[PDB]
Structure formats: C-alpha cells, structure tokens
Amino acid sequence: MSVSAFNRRWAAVILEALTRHGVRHICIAPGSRSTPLTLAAAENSAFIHHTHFDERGLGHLALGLAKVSKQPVAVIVTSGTAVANLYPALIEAGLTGEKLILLTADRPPELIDCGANQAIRQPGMFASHPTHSISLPRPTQDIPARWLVSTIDHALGTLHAGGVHINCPFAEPLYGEMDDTGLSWQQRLGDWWQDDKPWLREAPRLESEKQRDWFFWRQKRGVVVAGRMSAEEGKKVALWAQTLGWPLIGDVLSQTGQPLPCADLWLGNAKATSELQQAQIVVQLGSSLTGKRLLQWQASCEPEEYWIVDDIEGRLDPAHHRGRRLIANIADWLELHPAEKRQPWCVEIPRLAEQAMQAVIARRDAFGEAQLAHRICDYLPEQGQLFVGNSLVVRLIDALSQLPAGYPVYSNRGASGIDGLLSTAAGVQRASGKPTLAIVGDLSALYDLNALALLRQVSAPLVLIVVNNNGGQIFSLLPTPQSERERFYLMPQNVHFEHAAAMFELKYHRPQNWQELETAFADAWRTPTTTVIEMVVNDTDGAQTLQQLLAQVSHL
Amino acid sequence: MSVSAFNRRWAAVILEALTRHGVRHICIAPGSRSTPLTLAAAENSAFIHHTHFDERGLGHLALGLAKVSKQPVAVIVTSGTAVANLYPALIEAGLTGEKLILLTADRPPELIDCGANQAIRQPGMFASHPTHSISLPRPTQDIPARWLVSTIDHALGTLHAGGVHINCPFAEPLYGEMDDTGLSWQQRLGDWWQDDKPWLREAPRLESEKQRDWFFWRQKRGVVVAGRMSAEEGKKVALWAQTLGWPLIGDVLSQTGQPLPCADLWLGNAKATSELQQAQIVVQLGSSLTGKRLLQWQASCEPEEYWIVDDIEGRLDPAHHRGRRLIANIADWLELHPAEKRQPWCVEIPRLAEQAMQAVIARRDAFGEAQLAHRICDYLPEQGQLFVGNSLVVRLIDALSQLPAGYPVYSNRGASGIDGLLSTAAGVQRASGKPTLAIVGDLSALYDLNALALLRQVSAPLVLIVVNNNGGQIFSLLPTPQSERERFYLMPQNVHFEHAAAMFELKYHRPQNWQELETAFADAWRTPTTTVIEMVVNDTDGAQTLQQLLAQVSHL
Ligand SMILES: Cc1ncc(C[n+]2c([C@@H](O)CCC(=O)O)sc(CCOP(=O)(O)OP(=O)(O)O)c2C)c(N)n1
Ligand SMILES: Cc1ncc(C[n+]2c([C@@H](O)CCC(=O)O)sc(CCOP(=O)(O)OP(=O)(O)O)c2C)c(N)n1
Ligand SMILES: [Mn+2]
Ligand SMILES: [Mn+2]
C-alpha cells in the first residue's frame, strides 16, 4: 500500500543480491533520494560502510578499495551532479579493471525533463565507460523480485572487469515507518534470502587458450617486459625471466625487483638498443608502462612477434605490433607457459644497467625530488605498500630507484588522473590494513585536498609525502614554450600544506634535510594515523636531474 | 610537413571563430595534449584568460562567468579524466542555460582503445547533456579551414542555451618551432581574418508568439509566481503584477522585492490556499522554484490554465498542469502582454503575509543561521550582488527574508549541486566586478574547498559566509530516520575553516555575535579581497526554527 515501504523492499533486494557476488565494502555519500538504497545498505550486516561528502573522492575511495581487495565495491549517491562526480573513478576503473558497482539514485520518470529540482537525464550518462549499464524501471510489485535479482546477477556474474552503472529511480514518499508492503512480494524468492549464492548463476570465464607453440618460441632470443601486475606476479615473472635467460625490463609498477634497473636511462644508450634488436620475440606481462625511453623502445622495436599477457581485455600495445594479445591471469599463464633453463643471450645491457644505477648513486646526496625518488627504497614501511602518485614522481621513481621484488605498488595509471590520488590512497590503505607510503606532487594534493578528511581514518600509519616544487613541473620536463610555461603550464599556486594538515588534525613535518626526513618517518610510523610530510624543493631540479642523468648514461 | 605547426593552425581557427560569437572569457587548465588549443588561446588578444588546477572547479568558474555575462564562455582542458570533471558544470549549464564552450583535447583515433596513457573514449562521453556536440576529425589540410569554422559557426550560432562539447584530437609532435605549414590553408579564408563576423551567419531565433487571448485572461482572477530571472526582470514583474492586482509570490531568486514575503510560511495556512483556489489562471515567470510550500501549492492548485514564461526550453512545470509553456525573454514577454490596471482581488493573503513576517521578526535576536537568513537584506553590499548557496541557506532566505527588488541574486539551482559553489562564486564576482556576498554551508565549503585558490583573486571585495552547523543539516529538516541520521545523512565532519583561509592568505573571522559580525562585514568591504567569515551555529537550531515558524503561521 505504502510507496515508501516498497521502495525500501525493492532496494533491499538490490543490495542483498550484491552480497552474493563478493561486495563487502559500500561507499556512501549523503542525499535524500538515495534513502531506500542507503537504509537497506546500512541495515545489511554483510557490508563495511565508508562515507565521504565529495562524490568524486567517494568514487576514488571505492576505486582504492577495489584496487587492493580485487573485489567489487558498491557506491551509493543521490541524483544529480553527485552522479556526474563518479565519472573519473568510473573511467579509471574502465581502463585498469576495478569493479565499481555504482548504485545511483534517480528521480522517477514523471519528474524528468520538467524543471524539477535536482532531476537530470541519468541513464546512459557514462556512455560506454561502464562494462554494463542497468537502467532500472520505476519500482512496482507488478515486476517480480526474481526479475530484479536476475538482472543484477547477470551484470555482476558476467562482470569480467570495470564498473557497473545501476540507475535506481525512486518516487516519493521516501520516508515513513515500514509497512508490510512488498513483503509477500519479497517472499516470492523463498529461501534465497538465507542462501549464500546468486539467484541466477551466470559466470562464464574469459580466457585465452594456452599458446601451443611456446616451447618453440622460448628457444629464441627473447625479451621480457613487465608492466603493472600483482606483487606475487612480479616475483614469479622475475624468476621466469631469469630462467629463460631473457633480459627483464621491469616497470616501477611490476614489483619484479627490476634486475636491470634504470631502464629509462640505459635504454637511451645505442649499445643497449643495438643489442635489443637481436630480439626475435618480446613477451610483455602487464601494461600501462611508465617510462618514456621504454615506450619509445616498445614503439621502435621490430621482433617477429610481440606478445602482451594481461587479465584486462582489449589491445594494450599502442605501437600495434604483429603478434598476440593474451587474456589471462599472469600467474596462471606463467604455469601454462613455463620457462626452461637456458643460457642468457644479453652481455652488454647488464653492464650498462649497473653503470646507470652507479651514476644515479653519485648524485644521491642533494636534497631533491629526484634523489628522494632514488632513495624511496630506504623509506618503504615494513610489510606495507606504496601508492605512487602521477606526473614526475612515478617517472622519477621508475628511472632512479630499484624497488624490492614483491613489494606491493599501487597507482592510478589507467588514465593517470591527478584528480583522485589522496582519496584513492585512503581506499588502498583501508582495504589491506597495511602501513602505507603515498607520494604525490603539490598540484595533485591540492586537486583532491578535501580527501585529507578521509585520511583522518586509517587502520595503520599512512605517510603522505607532498612533493612541493611549486607547480606541475612535468611541464618543465616537456619542451613547453618558455614564454607561456609558467602561467599556462606550471600554474604555481604558491602554497604550503601545514594549514591543510592542521585543519584536519593530521601530524605534519616539513623536513629541510635527510636527517629531519628520517626523523619525521620514525615519528610517523608509530601510530595508526596519517602524517603529512611536505618536502619543499626547487621547481626544475627534478626535471633537470633526470635529463642530465639521461645524457650522461647515453654516452657510456 | 610539420604536424605540430599545423596542429596550432587548426586550433587557431577554432579559437578565432569563437571570438565572433562573443566569447571573451576562456578558462584554462594545464596539459600537454591541450597545447595547440592553449597556445592559440594565449596568443589571441581577444580573450580574458583564467586558470585553475581543478578541472571541475574550472567548469564552475566558467559557469559563474557565463551566469553573469550571459555570453558564451570557453573552457580548455587536456585529455583524460580532466574532461570528465567538466560534467558537473556542463549538466548545470544544460538546465539553467549558461553557454559553456568546452574545448576538450584528445588523443588521435590511432591511440584510442589501445592502452595508451591518458587516452579514453571521449566523443559522446557527456551523452545528451550538451546542447551540441562536435567531434572533430583528425586534423588535416585535406579538410578546408572553411568547413572547420562553419561547423563551429553552426554550433555557436544556433546555440539557444546550454553547453557545446567540442572534442579536439591532436597527434604528436605537439611542440616544435612554428612552421609555415597550414598558413596558405588558413589564408583560404581571405579577409575573414580581419572581420568581426562569423564565417557562416546562422542564428535563427526561438520564441513564442503573442498570446492572442491575453486580453481575456488578464481580466480573470490570476496569480503571479516569480521564479529565477534577471535583476531588471524582477522589478518589471513586480510592477506588472501590482498593476494587475494579482498576488505576487516571489521566489528568493526573483528579485521582485517579494511584496508578500515568507510565502513558504503563509502558504501553509489553509486560509491562503482556500483564497488561492479562486485563481482561474496562474502566470509563472522564470522557474526553479525554491520553497517546499510553494512547490506543494503548485502541485495542488487547479486553475483553468497554468502558464510558464521563461527563456529556457522544455516543460518547467513538474506538476504537469493544463496550460501553456511560453519561450521568450521575460522582459520582452511582458511588453508583448502588457498589464491592465485592475483592482486586487486577494484580501486574506496580504493579511497573512504581514503576520508571517512579524512572526519571523519576533525571533530575529538569536545568533542562528535562520536569523542570519532573515537579516541578510540588511547586510547586502552596496551596488553588489548575492551568491546564494544550496541546501538550507537558499531555503531559509526564501522563507524568512525579504530581498530588495532588482538587487542581483545568483545561484546554482538547476540541479542544486553542492559541488561547485565556491568556484562559481569566483566567476560570478569576476564577471561583474561587483562587491559580492556569497553564503554556503560547511559541506559545500569542504566540497569545493580548493576553490579558495581562486578567491585570492577578485576585483572587488568578496565576503564568503561559511555557515558551519557541522554537517548536512537539511537532513534534520527532512523526516530522516534518527538512528542512521548522523552517520549516513548528516555526516558531520567536525572542522572549522580558519586554517583553510590561512592556507590561501585570506582574512578570516569567527564572530560570536551580531556586533562582531557587522564588525567583520565593515572591514571586509574595504579591500578588493576575499574575506572568509565562519558562522558556527548549533546543528539543528536552523531547521527547527523553520519548522516552528511553519507551525505558527499555519495556525493563524
Ligand atoms: C584530472 C587531471 N587534470 C590534468 C592532468 C594533466 N596533468 C598531468 C598529466 O600529464 C599526467 C602525466 C602522467 O602521469 O601520465 S601532470 C599535471 C601537473 C601535476 O602537478 P603536480 O601534482 O604538482 O606534480 P609535478 O608535475 O611532479 O610537479 C597535469 C595537470 C591530469 N593528468 N589529470
Ligand atoms: C554534488 C552533490 N552531492 C550531494 C548533494 C545532495 N545534498 C543536498 C541536496 O538536497 C540539495 C538540495 C537543494 O539545494 O535543493 S544538500 C546536502 C548537504 C549540504 O550540507 P551543507 O553545505 O553543510 O549545508 P546545510 O544542509 O544547510 O547544512 C547534500 C549532500 C547535492 N545536491 N550535490
Ligand atoms: Mn608539483
Ligand atoms: Mn551544514
């Protein structure tokens, strides 16, 4: 009889269904139209609830949680620009594969296109960026509950990767005490309510077959390229490449231990490239490669075949090589394509890699961001995880540091946005419960500045280094025009982050040399809280150091 | 021969074309892929250039400028999630009509869906929310410059209202010395380069015809409702309705002077609704009505005809009355349908309105947010403008205060997002050069907090009142469930804004009484800077005061 009651019974089915597909975390932003979803979610004991006031950060908080847990994560927002704010994290998820189930409340059809407040056209709003899109009908008992639960079971069950938009219209009244309205409608599901399985099980797997001619190809002069992958896959890939006796180019996102470090430097040396030309096959595991010299070498190399192995779908080779695009879990694939011990065929490149790291060590002392990146190993929290921000820092660490094999690295290198790094870091911390080191640039920190609110709640110490070089100094690294560079590229904002931390009652340090930095760290890892460490450095020193080291190493 | 040079010539045409349609302001965010657009913009002397690091904020900055200037405003961003961040302001613009010309840089087609960094599927990503969408082809001299300008001229020329999405792929190299590549390509346009007109003039006008039976209807018992409209229109409507002798329900956004103030209160009195039942016609001018009692009366009233006059298109009556929906400039519309001197027919509603206002006046003393709203008419900057935020503040001012006729009010009441209020306020100030009073709640300030960066640059004093009632207290007004209310609705963040202001070197005040507040105001209007005034009030006092006042006036 009661529209409010059935609304909540309708919503309760939606949320309960999600529990059958491993949704545990649910991220909620405030609103009224979302009431049926939010109350069913708050009443449901399967969920861990997170809240935030900024829906774009809420998006990234969900992204962070899914990134580390590898589980689908649900988000509830109200109708309007709240929905639109989810787009960036949704777009990121579409590239790197996190399962964001967006439950977006909506006005009913009778309140669309009539000037009603906070009513917009929401179905189809994210275009092709979600993997599945569900535009739910207006709630009515004339549609069976088994339909609703089947619709959701289809979307989640077949979800290989990426986000799901579930548009959820509710008509007022939204409030009022609960009736029996919708109860017998709900009871039509029988003991599904006490079950732990989906109502409809549809879960086909998408996987490439084993490559039958691998034993042929593993005999050739090959190269292994390791992009983004799990910490455990990084260790397996490193051992695999070593046994193959193939050189391993390890991205900072690979956690391979980068046995040939500073590839971004030695790859600029013609001797290394001359040697790499003897390669008949390149086997790349993972993607979203970081460094410019590697992306240039990828683009320029011409093996007989180029293979890319990864569990996300689609083309991943921006150079469009003749070859194979193999969809698989990287660890599973390695077992299906095992290595057999063979003599290494590379002689020059190991020597160049050693000299390159040596050249960087010669310059380790200056109190700069390049040097910070270089030493970032000395500061990783024990049994923790690293979140690398975008722009220069990931590039500097990629080129200058040799990160430990199997030490977990996380990032937003799908679209490489600087818009959700603090809140994403917060979700990355909360999902694993591990001590976390996060490093971002100053424009990035400002962009998601209000996520400092989220970092007031962490389950383990989280150190946030904000590298302040007064602008987006990547545009000092790029050959930008000097006359327009500052105003239209760098965009220095001339701030510090002391008041930013103080506002949110977060410990803050502004270390002026290495001893103070080490002191700040020792202080920061002591408690389950976020410490902001602001490192003030000169604008272009980082960019100039990288360039100089590139030139030096090119002449070895 | 030179791709980078022609890239910049291609862009030069795009930006020059815009100048022919009154685009003066252009809002720019940093990027490399946007370089061709951004250098073309920086080289063009017709533009006023604004910069920001938060692309969502950038959108709202442009929205604010467009809101006041009534001209199209251009936005340039780089590819990726930068584009997605524009969606909130694009959607709002889509509802209330600002002409935002979005120049969104893109990777070329060959770097899409192949795992390239910061490359996403961008054409159509804003779905149906732009009024026009131009997905430009890959730049090439094989397409004449006259096609390119004609496409833009059509888009801008036929633009009645709302945003235009112009997706602009550019291939690298993006940098390099300027060549003569594309010059003769440009020179095919002849002396159009020295003209001040579009290449193709296409500007058909969209307008309703004179209502031929208006002489009949202006003699009936009518009611005038004033929604959002320009400041000059508010004064004309006030005069028009007074002359007709029809009661004027004036919304806070109307600038009519609200001759029957506190409608949100007396519309709750059964004697008023009975009187209003005698109405044979309702003529509403403008839209997006604020108050709940007015929205409920609109829903329940049943005149023979219901008219809505407004220059934006589509249905604007969420109650779907039998009647007429007339598209016209409101001031023009009034001259086409002049008033006749007629005796006022309402007797009861004037009595109730005065009693309602007295009832509010009695409670003016407490230092609460309701009393601030009530008293705000007394604190408006001379020759200034008011930017009113969303949630409680726009509602309390609508219900409890009487704003002066023709005194400019600006807001975001299309979708009523709380996500861009500060950056919009900056654009509103910068657009008019007038002293500005902006009022927002605490979550609203947190949401667009980094927009404080923009408020360091204003051409006249801007007072930002931040009302801090510790959370989204509109949800104390709504009958939300109390057990879940705090965690899932209110979301108190327990913060103050002294450090935020300190971060951007903005003067700050936290007045504890009316004397200190007036002291704070007087100091603030003295320099062309932004002063932050934080009013800390008890969480639910504002909401309950309104409910109590509603109760009292309803029993007269
Ligand atoms: C939402 C959005 N909007 C704009 C951009 C463009 N964008 C970049 C891409 O070039 C990132 C390349 C990459 O990492 O792949 S880097 C950058 C400035 C970063 O400034 P910072 O934090 O102070 O760091 P710093 O440069 O080390 O000094 C911008 C503004 C974006 N990515 N996302
Ligand atoms: C981007 C986005 N996301 C969420 C919402 C939902 N939403 C609202 C809609 O009800 C606005 C209704 C209206 O104005 O008509 S109001 C509100 C909380 C405001 O808290 P505050 O700033 O501290 O001020 P106070 O409530 O006076 O205490 C929210 C969170 C939104 N509108 N936009
Ligand atoms: Mn920086
Ligand atoms: Mn509040």
Structure tokens at A121: 């056209």
Integer CA distances (angstroms), B260 to A283, B222, B247, in order: 77, 15, 8
Nearest by Cα to B550 from B363, B405, B416 = B363
Instruction: Indicate whether B249 and B182 sit together in one domain.
Output: no
Choice from B90, B418, B470, B496 to test ligand 2 binding pocket (greatest atom count within 8 A of CB)? B418
- Resolution of the model in angstroms: 2.2
Using CB atoms within 10 Å of the CB of residue A325, give its burial: 0 to 12 exposed, 13 to 18 middle, 19+ buried. Answer: middle
φ/ψ of A385, rounded to 5, equals: -150, 155
Residue holding tokens 């009603």? A116
Query: Residue A206: inside a domain, yes or no?
Result: no
Residue A295 CB-density burial (10 A; 0-12 exposed, 13-18 middle, 19+ buried)? middle
Q: In total, how many domains does chain B have?
A: 3
Q: Up-side HSE of residue B129: CA atoms within 13 Å toward CB?
A: 34
The β-bridge relationship of strands B164-169 and B281-285 is unpaired
Query: How far is the C-alpha of B431 from the C-alpha of B98, rounded, in Å?
Result: 13
Which residues 249-288 of B have a C-beta within 8 angstroms of A? 287-288
* β A222-226/A248-250 pair status: parallel
Query: Which domain CATH number covers A252?
Result: 3.40.50.1220
Residues 131-170, chain A, touching B (beta carbon < 8 A): none
d(CA B336, CA B332): 6
Residues 305-364 on A with a CB inside 8 Å of B are 314-318, 320
| Nearest CB neighbour to A500, from listed B85, B116, B503 | B503
Domain stops at, among B165, B196, B227: B196
Q: Which of B341-374 are b and which e, b meaning 16 or more Cβ less than 10 Å from the residue's Cβ?
A: eeeebbeebeebbebbbebbeebeeebbbbbbbb
Residue A197: how many CB atoms within 10 A of its CB? 10
Phi, psi dihedral angles at B330 (to 5 degrees): -60, -40
User: How many residues are present in chain B?
Assistant: 556
Q: Is residue A91 located within the same domain as residue A148?
A: yes
Of B162, B196, B230, which residue sits at a domain end? B196
Q: Does residue A549 form part of some domain?
A: yes
Determine contact, residues B349/B275, Cβ cutoff 8 Å: yes
Of B28, B80, B128, the CB nearest to A415: B80
Which residues make Cβ contacts (< 8 Å) with residue B42, sequence separation at least 6?
Answer: A484, A487, A488, B49
* Residue of B81, B421, B486 to mutate for A, most A C-beta atoms under 10 A: B81
The residue written with tokens 């490359």 in the block is B119
Under 8 Å between Cβ of B155 and B166: yes
> What is the SS3 string spanning A378-405?
HHCCCCCEEEECCCHHHHHHHHHCCCCC
- Whether residue A540 is contained in a domain is answered as yes
Residues 6+ apart with CB under 8 A from A186: A9, A12, A13, A145, A193
Nearest to A125 by CA among A151, A105, A146: A105
Unique residue bearing structure tokens 């694939």: A333
Q: Are residues A43 and A123 in the same domain?
A: yes
Spatial contact of A228 and A288, defined as CB atoms under 8 Å apart = yes
What are the start-end ranges of the H helices in B177-312?
A: 183-187, 214-217, 231-244, 263-266, 270-276, 292-300
> Of A80, A446, A475, which is closest to B416 when you measure between CB atoms?
A80
Residue found by looking up tokens 């509403």 in the block: B284
As a whole number of angstroms, the distance between CA B520 and CA B523 comes to: 5
Residue numbers in A near B489 (CB within 8 A): 30, 38
**Protein residue whose Cα sits closest to atom 31 of ligand 1:** A417
Q: Is A162 exposed, middle or buried (0-12, 13-18, 19+ CB in 10 A)?
A: buried
Q: Are A455 and A402 in contact (CB under 8 A)?
A: no
Q: How far apart are CA A385 and CA A401, in angstroms?
A: 16
Residue closest by Cα to atom 4 of ligand 2 = A82
Nearest CA to ligand 2 atom 7: A31
User: What are the Cα distances from residue A90, in Å, to A69, B123, B169, B270, B419?
Assistant: 17, 16, 22, 49, 18
Q: What 3-state class would DSSP assign to B48?
A: strand
- Separation in Å, CA A493 to CA A500, B451, B453: 14, 12, 7
Q: Residue A143 maps to which CATH number?
A: 3.40.50.970
The residues pairing with A283 across neighbouring beta strands, listed in sequence order, are A224, A307
Sign of the Cα pseudo-torsion (B289, B293, B294, B295, in order): positive
Torsion (CA) A396, A402, A406, A408 in degrees, nearest 10: -20
Beta bridge partners of A508: A532
As a whole number of angstroms, the distance between CA B449 and CA B500 comes to 8
A258 with A145, same domain? no
Please tell me the distance between residue B391's alpha carbon and the centre of ligand 2 in angstroms.
Answer: 5
Name the residue range of residue A264's domain.
212-337
The Cα–Cα gap between A238 and A518 comes to 31
- Among B205, B213, B247, smallest CA distance to B351 is for B247
Residue A166 domain flag: yes
> Three-state SS for B74?
strand
How many C-beta neighbours within 10 Å does residue B163 have?
Answer: 32
- Please name the member of B80, B84, B495 whose beta carbon is closest to the beta carbon of A503: B495
Tokens standing for B454? 């923009």
Asked if the structure places residue B201 within a domain, the reply is no
Q: Which residues pair with A226 in a beta bridge?
A: A250, A285
**Chain A partners within 8 Å of B468 (Cβ):** none
Taking the Cβ of residue A129 and every Cβ of chain B, the question of whether any pair is shorter than 8 Å is answered with yes
Going from the Cα of B325 to the center of ligand 1, the distance in angstroms, rounded, reads 47
CB-facing half-sphere around the CA of B431: CA atoms within 13 A? 29
CB-CB: which of A114, A475, A491 is closest to B317? A114
A333 belongs to a structural domain: yes
Q: How many CB pairs under 8 A join A and B?
A: 242
Which residue shows structure tokens 């961003």? B77
Strand order in the sheet with B222-226: B248-250, B222-226, B281-285, B305-310, B323-327
Structure tokens of A103? 């439950």
- Asked if residue B483 lies in contact with residue A40, where contact means CB atoms within 8 angstroms, the answer is no
3-class secondary structure, B103 = strand
Please provide the size of chain A in residues.
Answer: 556
Distance, in Å, from the CA atom of B473 to the CA atom of B535, rounded to the nearest integer, reads 14
How far is residue B331's CA from residue A229's CA, in Å, rounded to a whole number? 63
Secondary structure class of B136 (helix, strand, coil): coil
Beta-bridged to residue B100, according to DSSP, are B73
CB contacts, 8 Å: A28 with chain B: 488
Domain-embedded: residue B447: yes
Place of tokens 């009224």: A32
Residue with tokens 């980078």: B4
H-run or E-run covering B372: helix B369-375
Q: Do B396 and B370 form a contact (C-beta atoms < 8 A)?
A: yes
Evaluate whether B42 touches A481 at the Cβ level (below 8 Å).
no
Residues A374 and A319 in one domain: no
Q: What is the CA radius of gyration of chain A?
A: 25
Q: Within this chain, do residues B66 and B102 fall inside the same structural domain, yes or no?
A: yes
User: Which pair of tokens denotes residue A108?
Assistant: 């009913």
Which chain A residue shows the shortest CA-CA distance from B501? A499
8-state DSSP, A137? P
A518's CB contacts (< 8 A; 6+ apart) are: none
Interface of A with B in 483-502 (CB under 8 A): 484, 487-491, 493, 495-497, 499-500, 502
**Which one, of A18, A3, A11, lies nearest residue A36 by Cα?**
A11
Per DSSP, what are the bridge partners of residue A262? none
Distance CA B460, CA B453 (A): 16
Whether A461 and chain B come into contact, CB under 8 Å, resolves to no
- Mapped onto helix, strand or coil, the DSSP state of residue A139 is coil
Cα B459 to Cα A435, B72, B440, B465: the distances in Å are 46, 21, 21, 18
Q: Does A325 lie in the same domain as A459?
A: no
A residues 83-112 near B, CB within 8 Å?
A: 84-85, 87-88, 91-92, 94-95, 110-111
List residues near ligand 1 (CB under 6 A). A 390-393, 416-419, 441-444, 469, 471-474; B 30-32, 55, 78, 80-82, 85, 117-118
Asked if residue A463 belongs to a domain, the reply is: yes
Distance from C-alpha of A91 to C-alpha of A129, rounded to nearest angstrom = 6
A138 CA to centre of own chain: 34
Centroid of ligand 4 to alpha carbon of B468 (angstroms): 5
Q: How far apart are CA A233 and CA A418, in angstroms?
A: 27
Question: Is B440 in contact with B389 (CB distance < 8 Å)?
Answer: yes
Q: Is A482 on the interface with B (CB under 8 A)?
A: no
Q: How far is it, in rounded angstroms, from Cα B147 to Cα A203? A: 50
Backbone φ and ψ for A113, nearest 5 degrees, come out as 60, 40
CB pairs under 8 A, 24+ apart, for A277-280?
A277/A301, A277/A302, A278/A221, A278/A345, A279/A221, A279/A222, A279/A223, A279/A303, A280/A220, A280/A221, A280/A222, A280/A304, A280/A305
CB contact under 8 A, A30 and B488: yes
* Domain boundary pick from B196, B231, B255: B196
* DSSP-derived 3-state class of residue A190: helix
Q: Which residues are CB-neighbours of B448 under 8 A, at least 6 positions away?
A: B57, B60, B419, B420, B421, B422, B423
Are B363 and B309 in the same domain? no
How were these coordinates obtained? X-ray
Give the Cα separation of B249 and A183 in Å (integer): 44
Element (DSSP H or E) covering residue B90:
helix B87-96
Cα–Cα distance, A409 to A228 (Å, whole number): 9
Q: Which of A95, A93, A45 is nearest to A71 (CA)?
A: A93
For residue B130, cis peptide bond before it (omega within 30 degrees of 0) = no
At A32, list the tokens.
Answer: 């009224």
Contact B541, B547 (CB under 8 A): no
Identify whether the C-beta of residue A522 lies closer than 8 Å to the C-beta of residue A468. Answer: no
Sorted by sequence, the CB contacts under 8 Å of residue A289 that are 6+ apart come out as: A225, A227, A251, A295, A298
- Distance, C-alpha B163 to centroid of its chain: 13
Cβ pair A328, A208 in contact under 8 A: yes
- CA dist B318 and B314 (Å) reads 11
- Domain check: are B265 and B188 in the same one? no
CB A460 within 8 A of CB A432: no
Query: What stretch of H or E contains A122?
Result: none
Q: Compare CB distances from A415 to B81, B114, B496 and report the shortest one's residue.
A: B81
> Looking at the structure, do residues B297 and B431 belong to the same domain, yes or no?
no
Distance (Å) from the C-alpha of residue B138 to the closest C-alpha of chain A? 17
> Residues A287, A175: one domain?
no
Both tokens assigned to B347: 């007797």
Spatial distance between the Cα atoms of B223 and A548, rounded to a whole number of angstroms:
76
Residue matched to tokens 């921006």? A318
Q: Which residues of B touch A496 (CB under 8 A)?
A: 503
Q: Are residues A316 and A410 in the same domain?
A: no
Looking up tokens 């400041």 gives: B231
CA of B476 to the centre of ligand 2 (A): 12
Q: Which atom of ligand 1 is nearest to the CA of B53?
A: 30
- DSSP for residue B528: S
- Quickly tell me which residue has 């009441």 as its tokens: B413
User: Is the distance from CB of A206 to CB of A160 less than 8 angstroms?
Assistant: yes
